[PDB]
Amino acid sequence: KVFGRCELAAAMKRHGLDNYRGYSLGNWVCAAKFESNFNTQATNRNTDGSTDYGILQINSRWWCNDGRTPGSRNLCNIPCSALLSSDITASVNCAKKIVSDGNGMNAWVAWRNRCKGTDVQAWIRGCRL
Ligand SMILES: CN(C)CCN(C)C
Ligand SMILES: CN(C)CCN(C)C
Ligand SMILES: [Cl-]
Ligand SMILES: [Cl-]
Ligand SMILES: [Cl-]
Ligand code: NA
Numbered sequence: 001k002v003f004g005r006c007e008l009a010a011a012m013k014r015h016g017l018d019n020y021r022g023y024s025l026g027n028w029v030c031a032a033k034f035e036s037n038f039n040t041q042a043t044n045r046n047t048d049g050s051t052d053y054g055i056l057q058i059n060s061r062w063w064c065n066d067g068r069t070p071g072s073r074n075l076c077n078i079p080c081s082a083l084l085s086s087d088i089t090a091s092v093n094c095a096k097k098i099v100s101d102g103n104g105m106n107a108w109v110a111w112r113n114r115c116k117g118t119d120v121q122a123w124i125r126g127c128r129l
Contacts, residue, residue: 001039001040002040003032003039003040005033005127006124006127008029008038009029009123009124009129010127010128010129012032012092013025015092016096017092020099021096021099021100022104023104023105024121025123025124025129026122026123026124027105027111027115028095029123030115030118031105031108032055034110034114035056035057035110036054036056039055040054040055040085040086041054042055042057043084044057046059048061049068049069050069051066051068053081053084054083054084054085054088054090055083056091056094057108057110058076058080058083058091058094058095060080063075063076063098064078064083064094065078065080066079066080076093076094078090
């Protein structure tokens with residue numbers, strides 16, 4: 001599913017991401033924009049052999065199991081395929097664990113490079129929330 005901007009913001013709000021670990025909703029919408037262009041089915045292979053999955057491009061080295069990342073962990077306890085669902089529940093639950101891991105949203109390099117320090121509230125401007 002490709003979410004609309006305001007549709008995703010609403011879905012992330014319902015699932016409890018708005019201000020989660022102090023990150024306003026616009027941060028999460030910005031991150032999703034640059035990670036996946038709001039496409040739940042986005043996948044991307046990394047040079048280390050891991051793969052990033054879903055709307056927030058969650059990586060198989062630590063977070064999910066895909067059966068093909070040697071030596072990896074599955075800390076969210078999910079198949080990486082669950083992160084591609086039209087229902088974002090799994091991606092949100094896993095994102096909350098990731099952002100709690102010590103570096104906050106710096107865990108998402110695209111967040112750090114494209115969102116951090118910018119006017120992120122623009123990503124939710126105009127939405128009925
Ligand atoms: C181009 N921006 C939205 C980031 C990359 N996505 C599309 C994969
Ligand atoms: C362009 N970014 C910053 C906001 C998104 N909407 C209003 C198109
Ligand atoms: Cl915001
Ligand atoms: Cl594996
Ligand atoms: Cl933080
Ligand atoms: Na894994």
